[PDB]
Amino acid sequence: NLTGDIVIIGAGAAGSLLAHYLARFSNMKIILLEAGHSHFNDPVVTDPMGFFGKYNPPNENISMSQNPSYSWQGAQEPNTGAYGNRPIIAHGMGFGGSTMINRLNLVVGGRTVFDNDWPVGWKYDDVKNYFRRVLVDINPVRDNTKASITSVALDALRIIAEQQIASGEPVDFLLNKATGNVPNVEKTTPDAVPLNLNDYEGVNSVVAFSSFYMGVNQLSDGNYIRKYAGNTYLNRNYVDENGRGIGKFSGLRVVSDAVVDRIIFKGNRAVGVNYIDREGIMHYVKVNKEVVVTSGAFYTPTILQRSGIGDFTYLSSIGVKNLVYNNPLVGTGLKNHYSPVTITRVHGEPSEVSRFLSNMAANPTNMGFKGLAELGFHRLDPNKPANANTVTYRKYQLMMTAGVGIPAEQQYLSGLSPSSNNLFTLIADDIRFAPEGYIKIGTPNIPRDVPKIFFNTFVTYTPTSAPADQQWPIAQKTLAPLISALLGYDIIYQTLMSMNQTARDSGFQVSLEMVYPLNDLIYKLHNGLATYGANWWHYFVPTLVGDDTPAGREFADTLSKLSYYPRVGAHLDSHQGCSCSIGRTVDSNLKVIGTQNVRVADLSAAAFPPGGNTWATASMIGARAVDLILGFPYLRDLPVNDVPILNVN
């Protein structure tokens, strides 16, 4: 049998990093078990554009996240907040996990969220060097192509930011505490300095910029390669084609196509791990010291559950025989981000529209993103943290892309065609998305793509018989996701209105019109915000409001109709996390509560979703686990100019 000191389950964002550095910094036997295999010669993976379907066979034109050979297919239970829909969300399956198949937008997530929403020992100053490590190992690039529309948008945000700052209003979506009197918006002059949303000390909590950072590297021939956790940490300089570590890393063993079932215990000590190879043959891996689970937010809790760690009453009820530790929180607290989509039409002469929409095409250095911002709370969002006026929280990630990013059914219903060259997309991604779900294995025998995944989003509030005044604080919480999504629309509406001015100022003879969701509805929403102020959202529940005026009914109707759009004019993000989080399933040392020697070190350990895309945070947790397991800050202390050497093969 295979025997290791530390046995790691899942070679994803966290597991790949963890394995690599444990081997480098210890004399221990490290075993990494991964369900998939390496894709170092697969252009679908190695070419960043493969993500967009560049190498898809025409008769099987599906993305990696839709393809069972490339991913786990996490089909969730009917979404009561979106007409019973059942989105299928992936974890990548191979060396690098989801970073093998993701869109490569590398975002740390900001200082504020770690300082406030994560526990002692996990504050931003505790993790910033691990984040720095994660970033320098990848060495992401900025967009190689400046688009005029990006400067027009920035200048529009500059204006709004100025409006908000001047008003003295304590919280609004472009305010940033750390940057004093000046709009924290990137300048659009010739030699403008880029603003860096990932700035080391976290100054740029709320910030507008021309470019995100993509996890790609340019090769000496000028081509780009996906630079992800798989090829960064498990390439042929470090692990040979048979999975055996090389030189200083010879303590490492990576087992490809090893589908782990469960962890075997003696009392509350893990002593072994079972997996099944591609021949359907079962193997036992002996564990000398620790097991670390890094199988992603959906699956890490399912491994723990099958292994006997979780809700005993439920596990017993479905026939899990060997029970180890009762913790009903295992798999609960599932979080994600969520991206409603808006579409804008640019009016004017064709040549002028064309010029205005030029230089937006996706390439590896930008993955389609032409800006724009990490934004704060809208002033009219009633659900801000208690101290939101004294520290700046991230609430939306604002993205601009070419094309028409709504689902095909919505393109049909709206009449907005992806082949119309006068349309483009803006997305205010809710990155403090209020819904919470949970994961439960349905059966005890084997890992399955489809455990029970409950994640309900834009649910309705059903009035009770209690006095209205007692109900409003309940409705406020229930409606939080709808409230935030509609405010996201208004943010975008505001931005476009200012772009109508800044486009002209920059010499473009064009006008911009928000056309998805319906212009008339957004117009009405904007007017309602001004009319009803803070309690505007009461009109989500008209039977409790008691405004039987034509105006009141119309505004209720406007919110009713608008509630449709975040439900289906949208995509659920693949940023699932927090299902085994610090303080609930594991302690601050990432040790699974009730066990001697099991840890969780992937995004499922995250205490609260980062303010932006989740790859960085997932690897960061793995990074910290290296130093937690070895008992000294080896990885934190590693100089930043010492980075893994990339071997393409």
Q: Which of residues 43, 54, 55, 68 is near a second copy by CB under 8 A?
A: 68
Residue 81 binds which of a second copy, ligand FAD, none (CB < 5-8 A, kind-dependent): none
Closer residue to a second copy, CB minimum distance, 61 or 465: 61
Binding of ligand FAD at residue 603 (CB under 6 A)?
Answer: yes
Q: Residue with structure tokens 């005029």? A: 148
Q: Is 32 annotated as a binding residue?
A: yes
Sign of CA dihedral 33, 39, 132, 645: positive
Site for a second copy contains 436 (CB under 8 A): no
Q: Find the catalytic residue in 91, 337, 538, 575.
A: 575
How many residues interact with a second copy (rule CB under 8 A)?
59
**Phi and psi angles of residue 289, each rounded to the nearest 5 degrees, phi first:** -125, -60
Between 13-25 and 615-630, two packed helices, what is the crossing angle to 10 degrees?
Answer: 30
Stretch 280-299: interaction string toward ligand FAD, x if CB under 6 A: --------------xxx--x
Contact mark string toward ligand FAD, 110..149, x via CB under 6 A? ----------------------------------------
Q: Is there a catalytic annotation at residue 575?
A: yes
CB of 259 to a second copy, least distance (A): 5
Residue nearer to a second copy on the CB measure, 318 or 640: 318
Residue 40 structure tokens: 């170092």
CB atoms within 10 A of CB 289: 13
Q: What are the tokens at 542?
A: 């008209």
Cβ-in-10-Å burial (0-12, 13-18, 19+) of 125 comes to: exposed
Q: Report the DSSP beta bridge partners of residue 334.
A: 437
- Give residue numbers after which the chain breaks (C–N above 2.5 Å): none
Among the listed residues 34, 137, 186, 374, the single contact to ligand FAD using CB under 6 A: 34
Tokens 């529309």 map to which residue? Answer: 149
Binding status of residue 120 toward a second copy by CB under 8 A: no
81, 436, 540 from 471: Cα distances, Å: 20, 21, 13
36 interacts with a second copy by CB under 8 A: yes
What six digits make up the tokens of 35? 């369900």
Helix (H) or strand (E) holding 521: helix 519-532
Q: Any binding-site annotation on 14?
A: yes
Q: Is 18 annotated for ligand binding? A: yes
CA separation for the pair 339, 567 (Å, rounded)? 10
Among positions 91, 306, 335, 378, the unique one binding ligand FAD when judged by CB under 6 A: 91
Q: Which stretch binds a second copy (CB under 8 A): 35-43, 121-129, 151-159, 589-597?
A: 35-43
Residue 94 assigned to a binding site: no
Task: Report if residue 12 touches ligand FAD, rule: CB under 6 A.
Answer: yes
54 lies in the binding site for a second copy (CB under 8 A): no
Which residues in 18-27 are b (16+ Cβ under 10 Å) and which e? bbbbbbbbbe
Per-residue string for binding with ligand FAD, 192-231, x by CB under 6 A?
----------------------------------------
Residues 49-78 that bind ligand FAD (CB under 6 A): 65
Binding residue per annotation — 8? Answer: yes
Any contact of residue 318 with a second copy (CB under 8 A)? yes
Q: Is 182 among the residues that bind a second copy (CB under 8 A)?
A: no
String of DSSP letters for 434-483: ---EEEE-S-SSS--S--EEE---SPPPPP-SS-HHHHHHHHHHHTHHHH
Task: Give the x-and-dash track for 440-469 against a second copy (CB under 8 A).
Answer: -xxxxxxxxxxxx-x---------------
Does residue number 306 form part of the binding site for a second copy (CB under 8 A)?
yes
Tell me the one-letter amino acid at 477.
K
Which of 373, 354, 368 is CA-nearest to residue 404?
368
Tokens of 344: 């804008």
- 29 annotated as a binding-site residue: yes
Contact of 171 with 389, CB cutoff 8 Å:
yes
- Compare residues 206 and 273 and give the one whose CB is closer to a second copy: 273
Q: Does the protein bind ligand FAD through residue 481 (CB under 6 A)? A: no
Near ligand FAD by CB under 6 A: residue from 79, 332, 339, 613: 613
User: Which residue minimizes CB distance to ligand FAD?
Assistant: 12
Burial 441-475, CB ≥16 within 10 A → b, else e = beebeebbbbbbbbbbbbbebeeeeeeeeebbeeb
Residue 106 and residue 215 in contact, taking contact as beta carbons nearer than 8 Å: yes
Which of a second copy, ligand FAD, none sits in contact with 162, Cβ below 5 to 8 A by type?
Answer: none
Q: State how far the alpha carbon of 218 is from the alpha carbons of 235, 329, 641, in Å.
A: 17, 44, 18
Least distance CB 84 / a second copy (angstroms): 5
CB 44 within 8 A of CB 50: yes
Separation between Cα atoms, residue 134 and residue 631, nearest integer Å: 20
Give the nearest distance from C-beta 170 to a second copy in angstroms. Answer: 38
C-beta closer to ligand FAD: residue 164 or 217: 217
Residue 574 assigned to a binding site: no
Tabulate helix, strand, coil % of the chain (nearest 5): 35, 20, 45
Binds 97: which of a second copy, ligand FAD, none (CB < 5-8 Å by kind): ligand FAD
By rule CB under 8 A, what string of x and - marks binding of each residue 245-284 to a second copy? Answer: ------------x-x-xx-----------x-xxxxxxx--
Query: Which CB sits closer to ligand FAD, 20 or 158?
Result: 20
Site for a second copy in 373-412 (CB under 8 A): 407-409, 412
Q: Which residues contact 224 (CB under 8 A, 6 or more apart)?
A: 47, 48, 216, 217, 218, 363, 364, 365
Neighbouring-strand partners of residue 33: 9, 255
Q: How far apart are CA 352 and CA 633, in angstroms?
A: 56
Find out whether 401 and 370 touch, Cβ atoms under 8 Å. Answer: yes
Torsion of CA 38, 91, 316, 281, to 10 degrees: -20
126 counts as binding a second copy under rule CB under 8 A: no
> Is 16 marked as a binding-site residue?
yes
Which of ligand FAD, a second copy, none is residue 444 near (CB under 5 to 8 Å by kind)?
A: a second copy
Site for ligand FAD contains 427 (CB under 6 A): no
**Residues within the annotated binding site for FAD?**
5-35
Which of the residues are catalytic?
Answer: 575
Enumerate binding residues for ligand FAD (CB under 6 A): 9-15, 33-36, 65, 90-93, 97-99, 101-107, 258-260, 294-296, 299, 447, 574-575, 602-603, 613-616, 618
Q: Which residues bind a second copy (CB under 8 A)?
A: 35-37, 60-62, 66-69, 73, 75, 77-78, 80, 83-86, 88, 93, 257, 259, 261-262, 274, 276-282, 306, 318-322, 407-409, 412-413, 441-452, 454, 564, 568
